[PDB]
């Protein structure tokens, strides 16, 4: 089997992307954030405290296929400070036409304020390795891990758009969605993520520096977080750019024509256009814009988030020894 679903930016800045997900019988359609940096599928629900709901909710008592997982609970927190917790059902879940039975659906009793405030996101669908799932006493498998027995190839691909719709595919590689060839590189699962080592970088039309960059491919992170020395080398080529303590990163004049940024995948090169690195005005009408490349020092790991991934066609190869592929597009 395969699935193919359209993923759409939630707002004018590409802060996150939502993808429809059908849960239960009859299907209840919720818009979820597909996240290669976590491993829980959780939703707003009829159990969620009423004052914390503003979203479409899952009602397990209206789904004939829902089963309570007796004794199971979950509790999760994320790098941006958000969190949620609750109890666990198994139910039928479909993405882009691909159906999994017995998927753990984590029903929120409570959600944090950032989730209440974001009317566009009805929950998360995690796509990292299942060792990161938060259900106790026994951890639950991701939608991808449950799908692998049935998929045509144990792979999924991410094709995110720049201020435009894009696609998540499960089980196949669309050879019309990219240019040149895919180059694959080794993955380490020792921390539960799609973790790999880039071979180096170049800024604009300058020289490629061979320096190993260990990082994670994360569709649920907005920006590109890289080592401080690398990020400094980039913004040195933007004459108005400066680090802003109060705003929380590099800012620059919206009128600038930004240089591209190139990263290494083995001997191959992925070029991020300068326009993608303009994240947008700090407020509507401002003359100052927020940078899309920021230092990873405060997070403690490098993160190839949406700014990087939306410049590439990205293959998440979930074979027993996993690998990660990138192509230009």
């Amino acid at each position: 089997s395969t699935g193919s679903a359209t993923t759409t930016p939630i707002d004018s800045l590409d802060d996150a992307y939502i993808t429809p997900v059908q849960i239960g019988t009859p299907a209840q359609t919720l818009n979820l954030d597909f996240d290669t940096g976590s491993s829980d599928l959780w939703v707003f629900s009829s159990e969620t405290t009423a004052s914390e709901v503003x979203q479409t909710i899952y009602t397990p008592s209206k789904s004939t296929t829902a089963k309570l997982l007796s004794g199971a609970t979950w509790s999760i927190s994320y790098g941006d400070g958000s969190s949620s917790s609750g109890d666990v059902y198994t139910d039928t879940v479909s993405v882009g036409g691909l159906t999994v039975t017995g998927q753990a659906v984590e029903s929120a009793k409570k959600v944090s304020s950032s989730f209440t405030e974001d009317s566009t996101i009805d929950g998360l669908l995690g796509l990292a390795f299942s060792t990161l799932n938060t259900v106790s006493p026994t951890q639950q498998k991701t939608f991808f891990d449950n799908a692998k027995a049935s998929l045509d190839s144990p792979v999924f691909t991410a094709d995110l758009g720049y201020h435009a719709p894009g696609t998540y595919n499960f089980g196949f590689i669309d050879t019309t969605a990219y240019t040149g060839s895919i180059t694959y590189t080794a993955v380490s699962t020792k921390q539960g993520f799609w973790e790999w080592t880039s071979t180096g970088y170049a800024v604009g039309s300058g020289t490629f520096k061979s320096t190993s960059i260990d990082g994670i491919a994360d569709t649920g992170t907005t920006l590109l977080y890289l080592p401080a020395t690398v990020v400094s080398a980039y913004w040195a080529q933007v004459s108005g750019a400066k680090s802003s303590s109060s705003v929380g990163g590099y800012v620059f004049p919206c009128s600038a024509t930004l240089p591209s940024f190139t990263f290494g995948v083995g001997s191959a090169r992925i070029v991020i256009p300068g326009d993608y690195i303009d994240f947008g005005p700090i407020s509507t009408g401002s003359s100052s814009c927020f940078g899309g490349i920021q230092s990873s020092a405060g997070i403690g790991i490098n993160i190839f988030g949406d700014v990087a991934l939306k410049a590439a066609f990205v293959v998440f190869n979930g074979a027993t020894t996993p690998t990660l592929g990138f192509a230009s597009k």
């Binding site: 790098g79 941006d80 569709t219």
Partner: peptide, 6 residues
């Protein structure tokens, strides 16, 4: 901006 698990 978003940053998805700890």
């Amino acid at each position: 901006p978003f940053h998805x698990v700890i």
